[PDB]
Swiss-Prot record, chains A, B:
It comes from Oryctolagus cuniculus (Rabbit). One of its GO terms (molecular function) is nucleotide binding. It is an enzyme of class 2 (transferase). The gene is PYGM. AMP binds at residues 31, 64, 292-297. This is Glycogen phosphorylase, muscle form. Keywords: Acetylation, Allosteric enzyme, Carbohydrate metabolism, Glycogen metabolism, Glycosyltransferase, Nucleotide-binding, Phosphoprotein, Pyridoxal phosphate, Transferase.
């Protein structure tokens, strides 16, 4: 149908149809008369997978021969989403497969919907890893994603009576055709035990063994025939484990629990033993694999020339003392050599400054679980503090602040301090965030080792987040400027010379309207709710957090409602306000916010006087595949975190790419986005970082805002008095109390400026031509936020490898 | 190479080679330069499996169209062994695959050895089910095996210091290419709850739901293009199960434990809740499946015309009250109609008279777990006892004896009594056993309903147990009489006219010697032990049990040793005495017997004076694939159970088929075997059933035998004094004490006759021509013990279906 989806040659279509039927018969053991759409999806998935494996074998082969430097991306999360369409896009098979399935009387688009998301992530951090893998493959880097194959990913969210209920994401129920189990590369991982010191050095003994079995998933690059590997480890008990009999067999589950379930906390630290086991598990198995692959190139001087290990936050920070343990205890290098190798090999990306997200493991946990690693951590700390003392003699407070070990009732290890000490590069994820690291939480570390600290602003892959999710927009862009932009997104700047072209303005707006029609229809089919598609689509989708200020959005929504009730017969630009996202299961306040959102919806959506002028919709089970549907449909993107709290954000970039205007604070990557588009093409409001600091210095008094703003007072009175919860008048007392007395994120401080800025948005939406011209200016300057740019910067400035756009042979 | 292995056409070989490489590349994602033998096995297994699926789809299709009566074989055990070679044999692919693998530079025989046994059984009962499935498919019956897909089968046995250690049989580690998961046919199974009685009848409510997910394995018939299904259920938790969060997800294991592990007790009852859950699980899921398939033919009069359910012992006895529950509570038939249907549908095979093996479930278990089934069982009991009272008025003892509910401190349900009451046919498994059922344990039931009671003597499949495991013997037989005997084993009688043919005598003996060379070599390679292959191979392989009297064998072995030490320079026919088998993990006495066997070995095998005249070898990890190796190698088969205790035996039949002579008691199917071969061609010794009874009446005094037999006294003194355990002088005090004071199986009563009979065996072995002529007379009359004969009898006399040897189209 459309250009960017590739050729549909007669032979290629013929061969796909043939292989579809071969898989249906032989692989699935089905005849055509009993096959369900699920069977057809699987038959298609197996036929597409066949086109990967030649390239996969050939790529891994090539890396063995050429022996390039190898990048290992360690993360506890990889939020991959669906693989089928992305694989088709990257192999130029999408039109051929659509044609092939069409001739068999099947609609590929409905088969795509049957695929389960691989939800092995919480949100931004996990998705960044997935986007990074795609960019690494697209840029020809010999890169490996290493993580955990969780049996259960991020929970599926049901709304019941307006409350979040969680249910297990049993994503492997029907099988995963994309993965290949590799039981032959199973590795032992050790826990507990104790340390003996011999004359031959320290020796970790009497350990519990858990086996790590790898599963490999292909990661195809964009049209370059490169297929990299994501290797995910699964926990398996050894066969002599616990070996009355029956119970011993049943107790194998205790070991296999390690890989059972993703911890569902976004931007929050829960210090549980099972979590620490997960972190060591992925680190230990991965490093053995790294070292084994390295020894097929006993001299570790060249280790950092052949190996880069990137730590995705502190979650795999134990790679540092683990690498030391292997090099010192097993390989018998001296400490200083091993440390040189370790630092030159490792690099740390920080993703948050919120103190409740920082990993600080109690020493008693580490002492019990990983006694040798704790010894090595103490030794690292001592030698590090000796360098600090020598650089800053007499500054004993600095020594206390910089220590890897923090004192208190509970002694803890600060894993961020470990990462900084044991890495040659430390980077934040947007310019303002990287600056905040140097000025606040890591100021001491910056003063000692200024050279370590870098910025690598985040990005998103334009394959998934444009070509895949918004083909109509990709096509009209490709009509004017060609297809090269898909792997060189800076080329979107050429769209600035179409900002006054009437045809392009019309096409940009037509695609947006088509996406909105399609999403409005999707809402009606799957969740029985009617949406006016002529309304402005005001969307805030992201995990539910106090710092992300879905509550601020809620306050605007109730303001628009109160204004309509005040002057019912005045014109107002209609809006569909959509808010979606998961709350962590134990985050009480986040769960209350969801309940408030749906409670507002219950009042607003059923008021006859409102009509279709204002709808509030809670989008259930926000996940990667729902982001692919709703982001192309959005007009207004809500990026309204308190300044200084959102490290980067990446949802923000997805919306910019897909023709939505942004209302947001000068936080995270919003600052760079506005800078790229021009501030005049962005709805910027609220406190800057500097204003938040000033307000902290004198003290944040929310009562002041409540006293001075009648419109705000009315809302707080409505919440308190039971206007939004008639049967439970005091249901939201915790929310009010927090907003008045304990609001860390200063919701009221930004209320007035937010509502005024929202008025300017509405004014511009009344003039479609100028709205769409502003949209074009956004889309055209979104090139910087390609993860290809991000990865090229990692490669050149941290890993020391040159990226490449050149094709492997097919 | 050999005829019975089929044709190796040029095109057929070419196509297998092509598909081997296709699977290696696409399915396994391996190049030739990194493939291990395991990869090659898997590539072959996938290529052979491809030849099944057309026939599989076509067979299930055919049964949908023709709608024959369907046989459901319910068992908790299916001891399948390896599938690869059996599949090749039954599809006539063995020579083509051997040629195809040869041309790729691979030895098929070493690839076969990589396949794991499917060890979802303990011994005889589980193997009978596997043999039955093969025969059902070979005879064109529309038959389904229904069981549990245990993650862990019968434990792997290691010997450590002469003691059995158990380790988990992780048979699915590397994947099972033979199975097809069918998550789409997942069914709910209910547990716990309580019963409400409404006006609309009884209602089972507040239940815990466990999901049953089926996995299908093909069961190919012998060269008839019929492929039946074995459907095995796996336990899965529902996604709202337990739904703080993490723990709820981790607790999904509590439900999935149901299918985790096979209970490893042979011929013994352990009344554990997990076992009862397994029994209900397989019954509940299976019956829903039966009923669903039936409703695609609301009138249940025709149910028994379309459905036969065979109960493999009492293990799936809950099928009876479950079928009632569905028909009465859900389908709303009246009780008497439902009962008619149930009885006409169900049939029960008894497999043991040992009282410790009989399932007697405590009422408190059933009351908690299956409260509705207990109500139905009481109702069944009441109406049954009303029939007994009316037939035998005033016989109140009979009422007490026949009750399904037995009184005592603990009230129990006698599940055998339930099966008899709720089945139209009850059969034993060998003629003497079926007679014992009518004269002793079920005498009362026989008097009430004589028509129910039948015999169906066991059999073994000659595909696995001759063609597959002993190709050389199959070939020389096929040279003289053709190949038709493989599916019509009675044709082996034609071999009686070659009993005086010098060429055939020589070939029969040559094959035996070749099998012995091959097995002696196997022993040396895999377990570093040297065996004289000119010696007589005296083998006892079967589960370790007191009733099977491995101890009697031990006493003979020590007798031969003591005789050699007494007269060292006298000639003795050399023997390799091989004993193998697993002890149930909690069966202390069985574990001691293993230790005695290895202890005897330690003394005997290291005595210079003995030389290679006597070796005692404990065969480790006796399983189906080891039976395939050792049984063809055997000269003497030891079937030495106390008369009346071995229901049938099936090892006995395997040895008869493969050219071994039998030394045994008149027990189980030995009686019919001797009757077929002639008593003169069988080494029969010991008490008959009648003699055991007489000895019980007056009382078994073991001291009498110890006092009268000096040779026996010496052995008991050697055991007691520490001759066989020098470092632990009293190690075997429990064995001695049992033999002298508490021997239920009368080992000493048969000692004298056993040793004399063993002398006659040795005498005959000195004359090879006459040994081999006796062997021919055994092989030639082993036809009755084909499971094809057994299944044809089930089909005609119980199920009411006609078997067929005719081919489906290819
Ligand atoms: O000894 C060898 N000969 C040829 N290729 C090899 C050898 N060892 C590794 N390779 C290649 O590199 C491997 C990639 O997987 P890795 O061992 O995880 O790096 C294989 O898939 C081969 O393509
Ligand atoms: O509606 C139908 N049309 C055609 N074939 C059917 C239909 N329902 C069942 N079958 C056949 O019978 C089935 C055998 O599996 P079953 O449903 O477990 O008996 C399928 O594999 C089909 O071959
Ligand atoms: N909030 C930031 C986002 O601003 C950022 O865009 C994303 C990727 O850098 O990382 C997110 C992130 N930071 N910490 C986590 C985190 C911490 C602990 C567990 C799970 C996720 N995620
Ligand atoms: N001992 C008999 C054998 O004599 C018989 O050959 C076999 C098949 O009928 O069944 C065996 C058997 N009987 N009961 C069991 C059993 C009972 C409980 C659990 C597992 C197996 N197995
Ligand atoms: C991109 C993405 C996120 C991150 O969004 P932010 O607005 O940066 O928090 C979270 N969840 C999903 C499913 C995503 O695709
Ligand atoms: C046939 C068989 C049995 C049953 O043997 P008996 O001598 O009848 O107890 C037990 N185990 C295996 C592995 C078998 O193949």
């Amino acid at each position: 149908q459309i250009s960017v989806r590739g050729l549909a040659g007669v032979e290629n279509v013929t061969e796909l149809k043939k292989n579809f039927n071969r898989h249906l018969h032989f692989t699935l053991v089905k005849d055509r008369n009993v096959a369900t759409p699920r069977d057809y999806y699987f038959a298609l998935a197996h036929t597409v997978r066949d086109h990967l494996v030649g390239r996969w074998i050939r790529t891994q082969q090539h890396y063995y021969e050429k022996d390039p430097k190898r990048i290992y991306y360690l993360s506890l999360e990889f939020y991959m989403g669906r693989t089928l369409q992305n694989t088709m896009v990257n192999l130029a098979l999408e039109n051929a497969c659509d044609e092939a399935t069409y001739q068999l009387g099947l609609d590929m688009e409905e088969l795509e919907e049957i695929e389960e998301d691989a939800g092995l992530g919480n949100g931004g951090l996990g998705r960044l890893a997935a986007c990074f893998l795609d960019s690494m493959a697209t840029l020809g880097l010999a890169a490996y994603g290493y993580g955990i194959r969780y049996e259960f990913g991020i929970f599926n969210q049901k709304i019941c009576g307006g409350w979040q209920m969680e249910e297990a994401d049993d994503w492997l129920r029907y099988g995963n055709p994309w993965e290949k189990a590799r039981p032959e590369f199973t590795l032992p991982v050790h826990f507990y035990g104790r340390v003996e010191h011999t004359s031959q050095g320290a020796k970790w003994v009497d350990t519990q063994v858990v086996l790590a079995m790898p599963y490999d998933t292909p990661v195809p690059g964009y049209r370059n025939n490169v297929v990299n590997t994501m290797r995910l480890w699964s926990a398996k008990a050894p066969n002599d484990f616990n070996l009355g009999y029956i119970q011993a067999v049943l107790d194998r589950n205790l070991a296999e629990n390690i890989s059972r379930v993703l911890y569902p906390n976004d931007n929050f630290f829960e210090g549980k033993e099972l979590r620490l086991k997960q972190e060591y598990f992925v680190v230990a198995a991965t490093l053995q694999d790294i070292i084994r692959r390295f020894k097929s190139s006993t001299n570790f001087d060249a280790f950092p020339d052949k190996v880069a290990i990137q730590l995705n936050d502190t979650h795999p920070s134990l790679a540092i003392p683990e690498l030391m343990r292997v090099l010192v205890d097993l390989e018998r290098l001296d400490w200083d050599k091993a440390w040189e190798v370790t630092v030159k090999t490792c690099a740390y990306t920080n993703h948050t400054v919120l103190p409740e997200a920082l990993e600080r493991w109690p020493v008693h946990l580490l002492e019990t679980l990983l006694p040798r690693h704790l010894q090595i951590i103490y030794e690292i700390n001592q030698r590090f503090l000796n360098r600090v003392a020598a650089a800053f003699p007499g500054d004993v407070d600095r020594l206390r602040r910089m220590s890897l070990v923090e004192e208190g009732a509970v002694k803890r290890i600060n894993m961020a301090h470990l990462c900084i000490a044991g890495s040659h590069a430390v980077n934040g994820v947007a310019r303002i965030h990287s600056e905040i690291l140097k000025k606040t939480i890591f100021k001491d570390f910056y003063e000692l080792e200024p050279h370590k600290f870098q910025n690598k602003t985040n990005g998103i892959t334009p394959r998934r987040w444009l070509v895949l999710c918004n083909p109509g927009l990709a096509e009209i862009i490709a009509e004017r400027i060609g297809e090269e932009y898909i792997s060189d997104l800076d080329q979107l700047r050429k769209l600035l010379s179409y900002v006054d072209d009437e045809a392009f303005i019309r096409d940009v707006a037509k695609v947006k309207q088509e996406n909105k029609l399609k999403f409005a229809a999707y809402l009606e089919r799957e969740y029985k709710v009617h949406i006016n598609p002529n309304s402005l689509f005001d969307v805030q989708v992201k995990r539910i957090h106090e710092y992300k200020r879905q509550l601020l959005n809620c306050l605007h929504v109730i303001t628009l409602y109160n204004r309509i009730k005040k002057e019912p017969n005045k014109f107002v630009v209609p809006r569909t306000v959509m808010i979606g996202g998961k709350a962590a299961p134990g985050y009480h306040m986040a769960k209350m916010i969801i309940k408030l959102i749906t409670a507002i919806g219950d009042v607003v959506n059923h008021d006859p006087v409102v009509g279709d002028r204002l709808r509030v919709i809670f989008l259930e089970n926000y996940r990667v595949s729902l982001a692919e549907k709703v982001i192309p449909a959005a007009d207004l993107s809500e990026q309204i975190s308190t300044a200084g709290t959102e490290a980067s954000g990446t949802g923000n970039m997805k919306f910019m790419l897909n023709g939505a205007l942004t209302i947001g604070t000068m936080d995270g990557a919003n600052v760079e986005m506005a800078e790229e588009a021009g501030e005049e093409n962005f709805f910027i409001f609220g406190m800057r970082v500097e204003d938040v600091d000033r307000l902290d210095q004198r003290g944040y008094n929310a009562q002041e805002y409540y006293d001075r703003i009648p419109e705000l007072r009315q809302i707080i009175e409505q919440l308190s008095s039971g206007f939004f919860s008639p049967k439970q008048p005091d249901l939201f007392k915790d929310i009010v109390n927090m907003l008045m007395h304990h609001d860390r994120f200063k919701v009221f401080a930004d209320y007035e400026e937010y509502v005024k800025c929202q008025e300017r948005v509405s004014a511009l939406y009344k003039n479609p031509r100028e709205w769409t011209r502003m949209v074009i200016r956004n889309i055209a300057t979104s090139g910087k936020f390609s993860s290809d740019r991000t990865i090229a910067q990692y490669a050149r400035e941290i890993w020391g490898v040159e990226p490449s756009r050149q094709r492997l042979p097919a």
